[PDB]
Amino acid sequence: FKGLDSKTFLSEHSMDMKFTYCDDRITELIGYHPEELLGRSAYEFYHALDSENMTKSHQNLCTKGQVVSGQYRMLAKHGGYVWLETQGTVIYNPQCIMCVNYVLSEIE
């Protein structure tokens, strides 16, 4: 089983929530290649049961500037759903969203 650190990765997003960048660490955790994430909305990946709430986390973020998601599931690359928690921050000059993403589920 992996340390909290080895289960933590960063993602960057435009204001529409498309990925603009993602740590390679996401590969050993969830399966995706950061390359394949760019231009796709985070929305594509949330479990239907978490979507309305992630939308409300998004609103809190845009209006307040920083947020903690609390728990949501992300569709894995090769089937199934990994639990996560994300802390989000808006960088204004709004210019982008920095996400620190922590995988709740156990890895290894």
């Binding site: 909290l4 650190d5 960063l10 960057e12 920083q66 802390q87 960088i91 000059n93 210019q95």
Partner: protein, 110 residues
């Protein structure tokens, strides 16, 4: 045009612990030319103190964004104006020391 900009992580002293490869187009260096060195080493002597005081304050600000502007020395030997927006992260399941997450963008001073 999107500003160029790269992400980095630092310890509370200022040492690069992680560098986004978008650094190449932004400042000229490979990630491994930054990793392990203090960001203060790449900073203009008039700006070095501001930047050390910036890293000292970002940890007292309760995870909120602190921004700083300073001149960073590219590998192409020029002083680039940098806007660095940083904040601390601390995983709330743990009591590990916080570290500092930075976005670094070449901006205009004018």
């Amino acid at each position: 045009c999107q500003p160029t900009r790269f992400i980095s992580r630092h310890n509370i002293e200022g040492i690069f612990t992680f560098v986004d490869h978008r650094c190449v187009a932004t400042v000229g260096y490979q990630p491994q030319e930054l990793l392990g060195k203090n960001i203060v080493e790449f900073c203009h002597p008039e700006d070095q103190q501001l930047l050390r005081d910036s890293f000292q304050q970002v940890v007292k600000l309760k995870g909120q964004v602190l921004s700083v502007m300073f001149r960073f020395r590219s590998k192409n030997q020029e002083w680039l104006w940098m806007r660095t927006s940083s904040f601390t992260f601390q995983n709330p399941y743990s009591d590990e020391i916080e570290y500092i997450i930075c976005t670094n963008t070449n901006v205009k001073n004018s």
